[PDB]
Each structure stands twice: as C-alpha cells, then as structure tokens.
Symmetry: C2
Subunit: 131 residues, 2 copies
Amino acid sequence: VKVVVDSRELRSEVVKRLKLLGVKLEVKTLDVGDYIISEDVAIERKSANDLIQSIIDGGLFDQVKRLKEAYSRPIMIVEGSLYGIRNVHPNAIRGAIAAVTVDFGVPIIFSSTPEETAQYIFLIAKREQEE
Amino acid sequence: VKVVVDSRELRSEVVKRLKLLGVKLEVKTLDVGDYIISEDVAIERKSANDLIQSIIDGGLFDQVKRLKEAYSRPIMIVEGSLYGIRNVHPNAIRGAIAAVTVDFGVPIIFSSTPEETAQYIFLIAKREQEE
C-alpha cells in the first residue's frame, strides 16, 4: 500500500508504525491534510487537546471546510481521550463532534494512540488499493 | 424539542435523561431505529458489546443497510468502551468502524454512558427543531 504523508508527520510514531506495517510512504508538504490515501481520500490527524482548543477558539469548522474543499472524501482521526479535559463543557465537545460528522458529513474516527492511528490509516489505504 | 422513541427504549436511562432535559417523547414501535429526530434523521443506539457481537456474527452491515434504506440521514451511537474486550482483534473493530463511517457514510458517534447518549440525542434534536 502507498500513502503520501505531510512532512510535518515524518518523524511521528504514526509513521514509524506505518513503516513497520510495510506501507510505502511518499513525503510531501501538503497545504491541507496529513495523510493522503487517494485523490479523494485524505486524513487529518488531530490530538484530543487540539480538537478541544479548536472548539475553544472557534476554528474547527473553518478547518473542516478547508479539508472538504480539498478532498471529496476527507476523514478526521481524533487521537487521545476527550474525557477528563476540564475547562470545557462536555456539550461543547459533543456538539462539535455531531456538527462535523452529521452536518459537514466528515467522519471522525477516534484513536487511542499514534499506533492505532497508523492501524486505521493502513486498513483504509489497503481497502483503497484493492478498490 | 420532540423525539419519537421506540417502545423497547421506554424504560432506559436514556429516556430518563431525555425527560429531565425537557424532551417531549412520543412512543412508537419502530421496525428500524431507536430514536427518530425527523423524517430524515434517525438514531440507532448500540452498546459496545452488541457492536462487537454484530461484527463477530457478520450482521453489522445488514443492520446499517436497513437503517440507510429507512432514513436518508441515519446516525449510530455506540455506547460504552470498545477497549478491553478480548476475543476480537482490534483491527476487526477498527475495520468495521471505518466501513460504516467512510463506506456506508453513516456517522458513528461514541457515548460513554446512557446519559451521554441522551445528551447527544438532545442536542441533535434541538438543532433539527431550529433548522
């Protein structure tokens, strides 16, 4: 399987696992997206803390808009637990999640670790190659 | 906000919280779906254990198919943690999740408790009423 990865992700643990899984990576500096699977499928990796921060600063919807305008089938992988992070009401997180997945129609898959994020990227890429 | 609930959910903790939130419920016996928000939006509540079981028995995709054929904008809320449940490889769960959200295009929102499931149903219903 072949995956294009944005330069900023190069030395991440995600890339390490993708390489262990035998994925062939092509590095590029992308204006949008972190991992490109096909001309239509792109993945944006976001830590739970960054998701919450983007909700606090009201920048999440602009981000999703940009992802959708660049790829017809974008996917967001939120990495890390969203529970236990105070300073923000649960409804603020829930509301944002519902908005992105149901309104914007962009899937928000949850990963517990960078290794799991890599496993998701791998299985999606494999299905793409077969498809 | 008004929500139609399937009879089998009547005495759940989800319904208890929806009532506390001031939601007006209409009970019906639905052939598909557990909570109906609009003519287009329906929600299927599934425990983590039942999701895993449906993957084991290969019945998940048939279930999603039926949800989609009944409602144009179906939503699945998986309640409970999917981690720590052996007898099934993580990739089996990940693969199923990716398939439903990306391939079938049905959002899979994750809830930690029946109370959280109710909070999601509530905020979605409210946005529907306003919309």
